[PDB]
Design a protein around this ligand. Structure first.
Ligand SMILES: CCCCCCCC(=O)O
Lengths: 164, 546
């Protein structure tokens, strides 16, 4: 609570969010974004939580074109609870407030959504989000310049057997 | 991605100007989204953000515009491990055998029957990070294995960094804010401000190794191929510590490239070196920036930017909307000569006619010459010593150039490459008279929209990456958020588009509206002031609380 935002949209659905603080600003951003892109964010959060195979089976791929099960192993490893906790503890109060607001605004849209702009209405993976989910997305972006480019290679790393 | 910042010495108005042309995915977790954020009195910034991140990534404010491009710096290092000769799950550091750590993760998998099964997977880790296997290149055998240390795993500053950038007043303030926090993971930053400063920074999170350590700590075979790789059996090859760095083991801000100018700076994903050739950036760590041949996009930009004439907004816009295939400048004159030398060869007739008629563009109406040229270039790239003038470090803007047709073996191989390219084009399903916009499209529901631009590897500034799907090339990435910002007295004047539109959802009214505009190359005002916003006849407003 204490979450409030004023949103204006100009041509082509560009939002202009005004708020008195970061929590309200995040609230407006999460709500406006969800109106346009709820399905996208839910799918990418499933990916960053390492839950693709749970919803979609091992036959599918992520939007990064990695197989679901290797992608899940990689993100389960990347986004372990200890790592998320340490990341959160290092965030400034302003950043924490932006993220808390964003999750609440996205979730507000989901509570009210009737399918007008949301094609995945009713899917089991379209779920309320948590600030931890936004940290999972942040960490996924962080490693795009490093270990994320070696995700398949990390999953493939197994010690030698008895071979010649 | 491309970026050009123009300063007071080259802009027509004597103030700053910025062209932002990031090349990013059209789908997924890196799909840009436009927004304007305001906390009255202390924050007012507009641009585009990435999914789930409540900050503007590329944007502008009252006196400043900035953008980013992917850099050539290393943001990780591989470590080659020497394994314990008695145990391949142990590795040696200074001759001492250490055990690998094991971290198991468990994943639920939905089966054929619809039920969940649990899969457990072991991730092996060294003191550097997890082990990685690239079959036939980075193996884990009984002698060696590779671990990967990613510098951004410890970068907890990334969100704070962009929130700070969003609050930056001018170029000097932006530089202070970035150098102070060092939270940028893997991009360059270019910016311009109202007073006419143009800034380039290669200020990101980069593993630090003191210069005296590099010759012995590098893996010679891998660094030769551009892979950051170090000797993991020697404790002296640990990332160096410097108290001035924001994070243990990263390069201090003072050692990373910065160029502040009043004429221009540019980057198209090459190193810092030729950001502005009047002041080359040299002498950095090989992990940071190297003097390598520049790509055709940077060569194109420098060809348009060098000289003394003022640059207007329209000039920068037209660098994007021209869809000029700059790589054709390097080879098409000699290709046409080869064509004339082989008049009456049936295997070359259609290709040579298509190439001669071609506008050297990737416009919607560009002829099939572009397709012949692309298939030829993919084959030319595999030829040995076919350049008439190879890369010359003393002439990096104009080399390589031309085909060495005077060399018989090259002439034979080039002609064969063109015959082979022609055979491939003619095999595929291309109706005669069809144009580039007939082939390259973005699907929107049951419909398609023709998309101008072409691959950045062919020197098209408006870079578009596509993949074959059925009868068409489907756009998957490239030009995304465009912003062109100038600074007239009344407030920032910004123009651009989000090529793939605000919404990824087919149901949305904003699923293809800007994509129709992008097809027609009709950029629009990005409204920022209350006056601009209130003038929009489509204006809607909602206030929400809980
Ligand atoms: C940390 C993400 C920064 C992304 C900005 C865009 C860079 C580019 O256009 O290549």
């Amino acid at each position: 609570t204490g979450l409030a935002a004023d949103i204006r949209w100009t041509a082509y659905g560009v939002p202009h969010i005004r708020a008195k603080d970061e929590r309200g600003l995040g609230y407006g951003i999460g709500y406006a974004y969800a109106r346009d892109n709820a399905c996208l964010l839910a799918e990418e959060i499933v990916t960053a939580r390492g839950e693709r195979a749970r919803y979609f089976g091992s036959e599918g791929k992520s939007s990064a074109e990695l197989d679901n099960l290797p992608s899940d192993i990689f993100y389960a490893w990347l986004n372990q609870p200890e790592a998320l906790q340490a990341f959160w503890q290092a965030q400034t109060p302003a950043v924490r407030q932006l993220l808390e607001g964003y999750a609440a605004g996205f979730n507000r849209f989901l509570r009210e959504a009737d399918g007008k702009t949301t094609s995945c209405l009713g899917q089991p993976w379209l779920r309320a989000i948590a600030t931890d989910d936004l940290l999972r997305l942040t960490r996924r972006l962080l490693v795009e310049g490093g270990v994320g480019q070696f995700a398949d290679a990390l999953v493939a790393a197994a010690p030698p057997g008895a071979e010649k | 991605s491309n970026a050009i910042a123009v300063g007071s010495e080259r802009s027509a108005d004597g103030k700053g100007m910025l062209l932002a042309n990031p090349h990013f995915p059209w789908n997924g977790a890196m799909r840009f989204y436009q927004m304007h954020l305001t906390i009255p009195g202390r924050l007012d910034v507009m641009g585009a953000s990435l999914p789930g991140l409540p900050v503007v990534n590329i944007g502008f404010s009252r006196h400043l515009a900035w953008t980013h491009t992917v850099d050539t710096s290393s943001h990780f290092t591989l470590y080659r491990l020497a394994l314990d000769p008695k145990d391949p799950r142990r590795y040696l550091v200074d001759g001492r055998s250490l055990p690998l750590e094991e971290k198991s993760v468990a994943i639920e998998v939905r089966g054929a029957d619809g039920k969940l099964s649990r899969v457990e997977h072991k991730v092996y880790q060294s003191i550097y990070g997890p082990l990685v296997v690239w079959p036939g290149k980075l193996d884990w055998n009984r002698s060696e294995a590779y671990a990967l240390r990613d510098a951004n795993l410890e970068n907890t500053r990334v969100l704070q960094q962009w929130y700070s950038i969003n609050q930056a007043s001018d170029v000097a303030d932006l530089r202070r804010r970035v150098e102070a926090l060092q939270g940028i993971p893997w991009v360059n930053t270019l910016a311009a401000d109202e007073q006419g400063n143009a800034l380039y920074m290669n200020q990101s999170v980069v593993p630090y190794l003191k210069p005296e350590l590099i010759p012995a700590c590098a893996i010679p075979q891998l660094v030769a191929e551009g892979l950051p790789a170090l000797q993991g059996q020697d404790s002296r090859c640990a990332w160096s510590r410097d108290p001035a760095a924001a994070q243990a083991g990263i390069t201090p801000a003072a050692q990373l490239p910065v160029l502040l100018r009043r004429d221009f700076v540019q980057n198209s994903n090459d190193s810092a070196w030729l950001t502005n050739p009047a002041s080359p950036l040299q002498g950095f760590s090989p992990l940071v920036s190297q003097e390598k041949p520049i790509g055709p996009r940077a060569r194109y930009a420098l060809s348009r930017l060098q000289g003394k004439q003022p640059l207007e907004a329209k000039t920068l816009e037209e660098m994007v909307t021209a869809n000029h295939v700059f790589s054709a400048d390097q080879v098409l004159p000699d290709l046409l000569r080869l064509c004339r030398d082989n008049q009456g060869e049936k295997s070359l007739a259609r290709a040579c006619a298509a190439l001669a008629q071609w506008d050297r563009g990737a416009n919607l109406d560009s002829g099939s010459g572009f397709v012949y040229f692309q298939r030829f270039m993919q084959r030319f790239a595999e030829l040995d010593g076919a350049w008439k003038e190879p890369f010359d470090a003393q002439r990096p803007l104009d080399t390589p150039q031309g085909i060495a047709l005077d060399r018989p073996q090259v002439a034979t191989q080039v002609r064969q490459a063109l015959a082979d390219a022609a055979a491939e084009v003619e095999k595929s399903g291309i109706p005669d008279g069809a144009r580039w916009g007939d082939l390259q499209v973005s699907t929107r529901g049951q419909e398609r929209i023709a998309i101008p631009g072409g691959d950045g590897h062919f020197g098209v500034y408006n870079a578009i990456q596509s993949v074959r799907k059925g009868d068409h090339l489907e756009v998957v990435g490239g030009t995304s958020y465009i912003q062109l910002v100038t600074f007239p007295e009344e407030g920032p004047k910004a123009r651009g588009l989000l090529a793939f539109s605000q919404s990824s959802d087919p149901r949305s009214p904003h699923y293809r509206d800007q994509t129709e505009l992008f097809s027609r190359q009709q950029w629009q005002t990005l409204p920022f002031s209350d006056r601009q916003i209130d003038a929009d006849p489509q204006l809607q407003r909602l206030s929400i609380r809980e």
